[PDB]
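Re-run requested by the PI after the first attempt was lost when the workstation crashed. Everything re-entered from the original request form. Ligand of interest: U8C.
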Amino acid sequence: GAPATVTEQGEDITSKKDRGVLKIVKRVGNGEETPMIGDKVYVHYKGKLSNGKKFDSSHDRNEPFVFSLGKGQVIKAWDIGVATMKKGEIAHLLIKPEYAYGSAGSLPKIPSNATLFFEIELLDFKGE
Ligand SMILES: COc1ccc(CC[C@@H](OC(=O)[C@@H]2CCCCN2C(=O)[C@@H](c2cccs2)C2CCCCC2)c2cccc(OCC(=O)O)c2)cc1OC
């Protein structure tokens, strides 16, 4: 399924080149532009553990998820991944624990040492 495909064909977008964050572009966005550190970013996502459990979708809160890019307001993989995205892009990310919740998890929903999968859509981004 979608997680396996990222394993097999995803691009390694980490600095350390440790396959900690793998990416496939599922829908090509607009232009060349990607967001800057500090930009307010608006996304819709669907996420799960890579084994399918704990599924969550921003769609269910009928409101985009909003954060400031590159400020540690989200897990490392999201700071790394969303920084590569164009407006309108949808990407798949497969994420090892080192770039997510590590040994502490985010209980009770996310366990220790969890690999995560997200489908992420970058709706828009704006400087504050
Ligand atoms: C482990 O490192 C970090 C961990 C957590 C954070 C905060 C968790 C952080 O979650 C995340 O980084 C990612 C990306 C954004 C979407 C939410 N999210 C998730 O993993 C969610 C997942 C869904 C399906 C599989 S994982 C997860 C859903 C369960 C609650 C934690 C968040 C978060 C930020 C802001 C708000 C929020 O919840 C709503 C609220 O609090 O009002 C949760 C920053 C971190 O790094 C600097």
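Saved to the shared folder this time. The beta strands are 11-12, 21-27, 40-49, 56-57, 65-68, 90-95, 116-126.
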